Ligand binder design. Structure first.
Ligand code: HEM
Ligand SMILES: CCCCCCCCCCCCCC(=O)O
Length: 406
């Protein structure tokens, strides 16, 4: 029989913009609570953080993603009708559609495509901006991987579009991008179902354009365009983690040397990059019907936020969360709720991120290239990144000089 700590005032949206990734964490410390209530986007909002609130937030008996995501993110970042917006058996079936791609062999294909693209950054020369090059590498690799025709002369435009999507006046700049992208891919989709274009099996455009939902029926063309965009867009967004991974290599020379000696694996270095650096701030959902957790009352329909970054730095879960220390993962298996940079819960039956294996494999290959394959200088520059602006980026965008093969 407890009261949920409540912030006074009519609107805290401005405060959420002011404090970004530190909003939930500042209030969890301030209140000394894993739960509190704010007002934003016109509504009462319940905020949560930590292992046990995470396990509750991913309890499908208690929470629903139906109408959870705000319509403006549907407009710019997520797409309408996507797997994000789905329920029960329908969601399980479509989520199995995404997971069919994440086989080891199909990811191997992707990683061969990224290696081949990366191999050409020796082309550009003695001075690269890593964020730009990463985006273009990833865009060409993931377009190829998904059977998506991407001509050379249009690589700037399409990669730019995906960037405005995952970085979403600028609001409707991102809106315009989403529209352009969606008709591009919708176009290609109808050329697939009418045999004017023939993408390979085990690619997203092929397997999605042909997908039969649980009725036995193909999906609408715009929905297919959305589901493809939910692979193209976040793969390019991996560029942010590329920046943070090379930054980690430069910022923590001792762990870099432990990576090169094999004391810590590449996977573990990647995990600690995803835990240490901010990227996705909160997941969202809605109380299904009135329930109680921990003596607290959740009213039906209440929008609810789970703190991903904050949970990843939770001092009750992690020893010295503020130290970059990949050895914290060796040998340590995470639960599905204590380490959640790309969502919590079970991937196949919950809304956890589809692309985690892809993310980790691409970042591990980056560690290999930027320690063993290439040599380079990091000149003095602004390598700081924001805790309040979303998403966070090292300011200089990682300017590398004197980049030569080892
Ligand atoms: C190749 C790269 C990626 C792919 C293909 C991908 C794909 C997806 C998909 C399909 C979903 C919806 C899952 C569902 O509704 O069941 C999702 C959600 C999500 N993704 Fe990823 N993503 C990628 C990269 C990333 C990156 C770089 C981040 C950075 C933090 C991230 C974090 C998340 C989070 C937090 C969610 C929501 C979890 C939730 O709603 O419970 N993903 N992703
Ligand atoms: C309620 C979610 C607010 C997110 C606002 C900041 C955007 C950072 C997330 C970008 C991650 C890219 C992955 C994706 O494209 O789906």
């Amino acid at each position: 029989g407890k009261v949920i700590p409540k912030q006074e005032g009519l609107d805290h949206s401005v405060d959420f913009l002011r404090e970004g990734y530190l909003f939930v964490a500042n209030r969890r410390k301030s209140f000394q609570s894993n739960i509190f209530e704010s007002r934003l986007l016109g509504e009462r909002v319940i905020c949560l953080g930590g292992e046990e609130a995470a396990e509750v937030f991913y309890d499908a008996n208690k929470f629903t993603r139906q109408d959870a995501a705000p319509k403006r993110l549907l407009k710019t970042l997520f797409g309408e009708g996507g797997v994000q917006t789905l329920d029960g058996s329908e969601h399980t079936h479509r989520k199995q559609m995404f997971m069919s791609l994440m086989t080891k062999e199909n990811i191997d294909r992707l990683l061969r495509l990224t290696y081949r693209e990366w191999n050409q950054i020796e082309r550009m020369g003695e001075e690269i901006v890593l964020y730009d090059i990463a985006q273009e590498v990833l865009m060409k690799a993931v377009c190829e991987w998904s059977g998506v025709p991407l001509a050379k002369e249009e690589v700037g435009k399409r990669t730019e579009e995906m960037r405005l999507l995952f970085e979403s006046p600028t609001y409707l700049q991102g809106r315009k991008a989403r529209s352009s992208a969606e008709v591009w891919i919708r176009q290609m989709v109808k050329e697939v179902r009418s045999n004017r274009l023939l993408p390979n099996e085990h690619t997203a455009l092929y397997e999605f354009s042909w997908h039969r939902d649980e009725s036995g029926e193909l999906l609408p063309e715009e929905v297919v365009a959305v589901e493809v965009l939910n692979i193209l867009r976040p793969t390019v967004a991996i560029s942010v983690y590329v920046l943070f991974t090379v930054l980690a290599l430069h910022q923590f020379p001792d762990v870099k040397e432990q990576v090169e000696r094999g004391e810590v694996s590449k996977t573990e270095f990647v995990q600690e990059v995803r835990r240490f650096y901010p990227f996705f701030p909160v997941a969202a959902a809605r109380v299904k019907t009135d329930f109680e957790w921990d003596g607290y009352a959740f009213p039906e329909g209440t929008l609810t936020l789970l703190d991903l970054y904050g949970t990843n730095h939770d001092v009750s879960i992690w020893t010295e969360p503020d130290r970059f220390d990949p050895s914290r993962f060796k040998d340590w298996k995470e639960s599905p709720f204590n380490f959640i940079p790309q969502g919590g819960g079970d991937v196949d039956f919950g809304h956890r991120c589809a692309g985690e294996h892809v993310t980790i494999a691409i970042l591990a290959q980056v560690i290999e290239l930027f320690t063993k394959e290439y040599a380079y200088t990091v000149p003095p520059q602004d390598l700081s990144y924001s805790f309040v602006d979303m998403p966070s980026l090292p300011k200089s965008k990682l300017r590398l000089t004197h980049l030569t093969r080892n």
